[PDB]
Amino acid sequence: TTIVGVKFNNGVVIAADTRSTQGPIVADKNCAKLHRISPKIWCAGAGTAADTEAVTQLIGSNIELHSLYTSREPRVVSALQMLKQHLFKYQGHIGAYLIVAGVDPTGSHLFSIHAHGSTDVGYYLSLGSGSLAAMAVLESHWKQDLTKEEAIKLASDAIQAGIWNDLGSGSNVDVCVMEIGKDAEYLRNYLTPNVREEKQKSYKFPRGTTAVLKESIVNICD
Amino acid sequence: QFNPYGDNGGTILGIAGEDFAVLAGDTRNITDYSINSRYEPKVFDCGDNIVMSANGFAADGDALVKRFKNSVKWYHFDHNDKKLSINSAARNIQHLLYGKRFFPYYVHTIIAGLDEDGKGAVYSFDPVGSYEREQCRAGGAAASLIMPFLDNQVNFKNQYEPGTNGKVKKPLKYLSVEEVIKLVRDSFTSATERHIQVGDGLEILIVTKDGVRKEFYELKRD
Amino acid sequence: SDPSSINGGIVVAMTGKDCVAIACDLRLGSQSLGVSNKFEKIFHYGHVFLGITGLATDVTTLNEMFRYKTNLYKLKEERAIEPETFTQLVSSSLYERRFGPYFVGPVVAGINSKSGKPFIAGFDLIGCIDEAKDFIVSGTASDQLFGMCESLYEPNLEPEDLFETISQALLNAADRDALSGWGAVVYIIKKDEVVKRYLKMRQD
Amino acid sequence: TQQPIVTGTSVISMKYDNGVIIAADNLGSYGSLLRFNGVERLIPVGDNTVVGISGDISDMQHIERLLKDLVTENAYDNPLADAEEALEPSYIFEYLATVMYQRRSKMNPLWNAIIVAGVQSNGDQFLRYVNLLGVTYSSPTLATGFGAHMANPLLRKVVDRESDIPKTTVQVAEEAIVNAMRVLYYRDARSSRNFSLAIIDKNTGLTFKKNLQVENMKWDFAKDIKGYGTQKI
Amino acid sequence: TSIMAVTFKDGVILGADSRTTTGAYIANRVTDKLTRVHDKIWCCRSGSAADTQAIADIVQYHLELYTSQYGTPSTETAASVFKELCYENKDNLTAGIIVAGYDDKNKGEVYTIPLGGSVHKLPYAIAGSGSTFIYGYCDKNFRENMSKEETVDFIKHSLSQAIKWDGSSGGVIRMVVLTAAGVERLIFYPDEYEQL
Amino acid sequence: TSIMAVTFKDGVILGADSRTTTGAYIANRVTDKLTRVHDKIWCCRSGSAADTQAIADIVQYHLELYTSQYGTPSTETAASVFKELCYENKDNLTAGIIVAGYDDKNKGEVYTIPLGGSVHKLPYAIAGSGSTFIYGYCDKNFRENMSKEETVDFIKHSLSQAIKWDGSSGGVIRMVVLTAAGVERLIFYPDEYEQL
Amino acid sequence: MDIILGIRVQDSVILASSKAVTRGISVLKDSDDKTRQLSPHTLMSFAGEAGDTVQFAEYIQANIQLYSIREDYELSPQAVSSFVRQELAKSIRSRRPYQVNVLIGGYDKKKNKPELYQIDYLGTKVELPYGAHGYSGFYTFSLLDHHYRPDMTTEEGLDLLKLCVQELEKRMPMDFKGVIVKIVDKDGIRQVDDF
Amino acid sequence: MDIILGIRVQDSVILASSKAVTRGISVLKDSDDKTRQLSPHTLMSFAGEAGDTVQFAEYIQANIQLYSIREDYELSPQAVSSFVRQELAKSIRSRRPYQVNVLIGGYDKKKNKPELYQIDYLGTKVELPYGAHGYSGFYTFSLLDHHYRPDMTTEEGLDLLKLCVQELEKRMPMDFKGVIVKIVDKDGIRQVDDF
Amino acid sequence: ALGATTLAFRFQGGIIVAVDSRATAGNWVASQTVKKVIEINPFLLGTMAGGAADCQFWETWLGSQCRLHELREKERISVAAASKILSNLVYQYKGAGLSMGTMICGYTRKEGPTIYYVDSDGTRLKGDIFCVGSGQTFAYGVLDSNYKWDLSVEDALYLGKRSILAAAHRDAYSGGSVNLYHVTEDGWIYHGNHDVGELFWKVKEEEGSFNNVIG
């Protein structure tokens, strides 16, 4: 994985690649690493795939119940606190590396969380196997007082660096923009620069090619 | 402790026709999750209409090829410029590999050319020198992905004649150079999609009685 | 002593035009020794189909477990479970055993009775969902299946054509794996009819 | 069987339209201790080659001696030692690559990663890598250690393939290298601010720049960062 | 890490670098290792980032609950809570913490808590991987009852050297001043401290 | 061990502690770690006592044979012989040696040879387990072209701190002065240097 | 290496189990019966870790006998095999698992069909025409694969079984001191005394 | 566990050696002769590591035959046993030692007495009335200790030997496929074909 | 690391040699077309089990030594002498890591049909029937029960073919195809390559065996 987060004027943006590996094999060429914790709090996840989904769904559920209980919109620091305490308790055995971001009544926020339960604050962050490729871009092009359109550009450029240069990352670029006073816009497949070329030949078989021993109608009805 | 071996990834493919033979291989060189080169050739013209590739640990691969090229040179000196037949080259390579039986070259070796009857020939070696002549052979990282596809499309395995109750097999036949290159290109584009160590570029070396021709095709760079 | 490769086996699933297909080999072994050629790895709960590879005791155990859960689901909900919902149930159940997992590689396949949309999905042993438009693979010859499916597959295949494509993907993958083979079964699934075909393959 | 003691970190390089650029910091680390600060890890051979070395410094000093002795030996009984029969980058590289592979095959390696940058007699750019395993490869951009992970991505944005080399000027290429060295200073814990840079041009020849410093750094935003989550003060 | 806390005439000053590492990679170059557990009781964190954060969060909770019931806690009380956590969970923790605070009665106080969980009250304290390189410098240059400006220079020069020699230390030098006047944050950038 | 060598206006001064350890037991509290390989080329020894003695004995033999044939060797030549032994036998040695000498042409020179067998020519050098604690102090206080008395004080204060913090260093402070005047041995006892 | 074999023929199930009990370099016994009757028409043979085998077999026996008394009804071989599998499936993830492999031979009185089930210590169940555990399968399966026909009589099954024992006695390294053979059919369970 | 036994009686030496050759879970052969004739009145049986046994036995055989040709004279059993011991005594401190245990049965023509020597792979020589190698001694020595008399005939020795083989076949875990028996006396070496 | 099924047996009409064709690298099936009978010379055969390279290299080397023997002695080499040259050679390399399990087969005047099992730990056994590999147990079962000295050449060829099939079926690491050989005093005769896929179905139907398998 490659995942990033970038702060801008009136909010925050996060992005991710879409590759999912199983050893050296690509299991999913277009998987979603951007998760919704609450409507305006989204999370990018790297590491053990089941762990990032499970831990983000659990905290998201508890955040919803908390939001209903308190009659308030959820805060990013609450999701942050709940996540890190959960991860710390399991001493790193839950391999979830997250970039947590969102907007709430307090303002716009951007954090990262590591598997062992440590958190960090920043204006620009990157996690995953392609984090070094991404961070190189962020360190080269980031500046204070970014606009919305500049931050999306920087974020996707950082993910592309991972896509091209890191073998762990690939395929497409997902983005989510969280601006203050507006609905969060999830941009699934914001960029698709790895389209498979036309094959040289069709491998559609003549019917009856496959040898068959038995046929039978299966009963799915009651 | 010092580990003298490494894995430079990559995958290679040798197919033999009626009056020709191809030896293909991707141009990507890697270590762990990094890309070292997007274009580093590993299929070589060794002289006497013999093409060769040694895939796996690049340092051992370059050493072996270098030694065989040298072996060809001295065969000419010692035997009045006699042409080294593909079968004689194969036996010679066995002795090169087995000479290091107790400190092996970590490579999968494949050579291609024409036999003494003018028909296409491909030979494949294990790291310690066992060899065999074959119509079709894939080697390297993505060999497991490509090889069963060749079994199906080159040797027509598991394909029976339509209407014959799976009693009459589909007849074996020689393919054209054009049909073979189609299968090679489709083999590598498929492997590129599902194997992280495969991509960047594809270089094919075709061998006919006229000589050795080259063809290059781009692959996905993610 | 690698639980996922003791018994051997493979499962593959594909989508077509208004249909899905799921197929499995029939082998069960104890490492090198072949024990049974009738060990089917595909099960169905109503109109939702589930294929499971990996450790055979866990395959059997999970089938019994999802039969248990889908029967109770139906009694309470007064309707059969859909593929999208079943996929989430499988994921939940597997992650419940996160630190003592079932050594399996399940595959869900089916058509939504309401929308009519074809659906397939795959999982890892701890419940991560791998949803896909095209195909899903699982088992000891997963590498081989990935190579066949990625080259042979094309979108919007008709049931009769789809049958040939999945059957050839499975057969040629199984023949390049020692621990898979010994027979094969293919399910072709349409909106309101399901055909099951046993394939003829080499028995070595 | 060895273990490296005093070490040098990343060496980065790239090709441009008329030649090649190479750079490396002036540090000799002793584990976590930044022990030696006046270490030159770029070593010119003649007026057309520069060898950049990372890894064990004692093994680097050994290679320096071999290269110095190689120049001496080439001049013996050679009237064209400063002309047609002068040492080429390809000659120097193959010699080192032969040595590195021989040493790994005796299970007594030179614990280094080497990049040989130069310009051939016909004007062609030469840039090739070799390491303790005897592994070799060439590319428009090459880097060692952390540079492979952080510098290559930045340098490949300039020269992504072979066709981008004629389009890349020395001004642009040098700018990218200097930017890369800054990024490594931000993010590599065994790096230093001071570094050396060398340019080998087919027209202007060898330009060797010493005592460079990373500058135009961004640190101001650090003042706004407070705590690790909830802390406001 | 390189961290230190120094008592002086008007109170106490905490000092720290801003580097966080994963092997040789710098995961964060602008880290804040000076953390508040109470209005005028702060701590310097070294060791595991996860462990030190978890501990500091618990201590802040304990002192907030203490304040609700018994009023403002002493710096000694804060150090005791830290110790209790570090000592009783010594097998599962990697945390070297320096506790520093300002009372009106007791003035500036500094307590250091090494790996084992022992407590040591000192005039000044240094800790972290980079502290090893400045034991000699700090011992020779420390004086009791220094002024604010003298103490700032002492910490600046000390951490400057620690950063220079330790690869695990670097970035900016953060400082926190604790006096009767209030709480003041300071920062010093590379271009300044490097050429001292 | 704590050892150092410092160049100054008139030449070079070598300095060392006198402690030899076997675990935590002090096998020798009055050790002489400053050893002569030539009239005005000396070395500071750290690491294995056996290895450093064997090496120094061989170097002295090589330089005695050099002198018989080619006259007085340079300090650089002496450092090269040390290096050759330390580098080629790096797998079987534990020796951190500082070579120091006085020429009339080159004046005072200092070369340090760490574990790997690399050579580094420096204005001054520090080595040994106790050197870690004085990197900061020595960097801040060293100046080029110091006087003899200034250089003696620099070494005395530096090794004083090294001894204070390092358990593996202690005893007396031996020093050897190398100038055109000749060779002067110095010694400083605990009662003096401890209370600096 | 306790040799247990099983063959399902037309009208019965035949189980053959070795008589040797070895401990170290000594054959302590040469007349051991490695089986327990679970019900009048269901028989279970077993092999594996010492102690665990008998403890497990008798525990299953007790549970099935309890069921028979409670319901005044005999459980089908399929039902018994499923119960046994679940117990082993629980066991494998316990603190100390039962290291026991079993064959379950039974005659279903409702279907009027013989049934043979093979269950290993992991809880891996399969219904088979013929089965074995341990290294035994490695020798006999080739013979059974060849000479086995589905319509065989009990006498033909015993001759087929003799052929397997002869092959084991020829090629196996250890002396297993012959086998006790038992037949399960419509009339219940009986032992062949002369084999 | 290749059984080799030896019994010295009044007028002869009797050696018994197992016929089985096992590799993994397969008995590759059941008619193997684990002995070599060193000279007309000297016989050596052997057991131990695969390959080493035959290589060592044949090497000794060649050396003794060379001596016989050179001197036109047969070496005494005592002399042969000493030579064999020294070769094993050298071997044990070599780079790769011979892991071979031997019994040397011979008839001394000058003394008119039978002689049995037991030599293990370390080069530990002992002259004995009866001997064994491996686990074999653990079963038979109690029997020999009891029924053995020094004035026995060859026929009485063979009956005593039968008693040992029967005990081994009863209590030993592995099937060793019987034994080849050979007798050494004044008239030389001969094999008992029916045992 | 090679799964295999190889056999060789003596009978009235000489020697039958039969092998499978599969090569595996773990679970991955590398080849189905491997030649596991090495044609040492026109009169001698060798089987390949264990190391592929070790068997190929040294049994080819053996053929060179046999050719030199008959050049110097003007007589065909005995199977005993040929087998011993190979066994003495691998014994020198003992401990180094060679992996072999082979049957050296031949038919001469003084010996008749002769088979020697030669193995990498130094073993050299003369015998009538040998089976070697991951599937040896399955093949032994068919061989032992059906073997007789007075077998005809036609029936003996089938027995060897049927025995490999038995192993190819059950053993996962055995299969592909069956290669047959008949060794006579005048030399060996190749009796073709037989795909197991086609052979299995054919034998099932004609013999009535493998009822457990649906077809």
Ligand SMILES: *[C@@](C)(CO)[C@](*)(O)[C@H](CC(C)C)NC(=O)[C@H](Cc1ccccc1)NC(=O)[C@H](CC(C)C)NC(=O)[C@H](CCc1ccccc1)NC(=O)CN1CCOCC1
């Ligand atoms: C980049 C792409 C790689 O770093 C990203 O970090 C992504 C993150 C996204 C997908 C959320 N990471 C992965 O894709 C991740 C990499 C990885 C692999 C193994 C351990 C940790 C991280 N891949 C996975 O988590 C896959 C997801 C699959 C493709 C659906 N899962 C596996 O590879 C599982 C590992 C499960 C696991 C268990 C216990 C501890 C850690 C991980 N492995 C298998 O399924 C392999 N095997 C197959 C046979 O059945 C038994 C298991």
Ligand SMILES: *[C@@](C)(CO)[C@](*)(O)[C@H](CC(C)C)NC(=O)[C@H](Cc1ccccc1)NC(=O)[C@H](CC(C)C)NC(=O)[C@H](CCc1ccccc1)NC(=O)CN1CCOCC1
């Ligand atoms: C200086 C650096 C040293 O004294 C300071 O003390 C700082 C303290 C600040 C941040 C409060 N310490 C660190 O930066 C600390 C160094 C460290 C590392 C390991 C154990 C103890 C201390 N770094 C961390 O804690 C990082 C922070 C992450 C990157 C946000 N965490 C890791 O390095 C984790 C820690 C896991 C762990 C191990 C043992 C005890 C507790 C936790 N390790 C990894 O991720 C492993 N890593 C995988 C990639 O390959 C190299 C190893």
Ligand SMILES: *[C@@](C)(CO)[C@](*)(O)[C@H](CC(C)C)NC(=O)[C@H](Cc1ccccc1)NC(=O)[C@H](CC(C)C)NC(=O)[C@H](CCc1ccccc1)NC(=O)CN1CCOCC1
């Ligand atoms: C300071 C102390 C550290 O840098 C100095 O460097 C001095 C150098 C002077 C003496 C030139 N170093 C020592 O005093 C040195 C410390 C040391 C120990 C081990 C390895 C390297 C350095 N001490 C020694 O060399 C002593 C001197 C003896 C007592 C006269 N020797 C030992 O301690 C021996 C050394 C064996 C050895 C180990 C590894 C490499 C080389 C040599 N060790 C023992 O006797 C073992 N001892 C047995 C009693 O129980 C504890 C261990």
Ligand SMILES: [Cl-]
């Ligand atoms: Cl932190």
Ligand SMILES: [Cl-]
């Ligand atoms: Cl000393």
Ligand SMILES: [Mg+2]
């Ligand atoms: Mg990529």
Ligand SMILES: [Mg+2]
């Ligand atoms: Mg001291």
Ligand SMILES: [Mg+2]
């Ligand atoms: Mg098979």
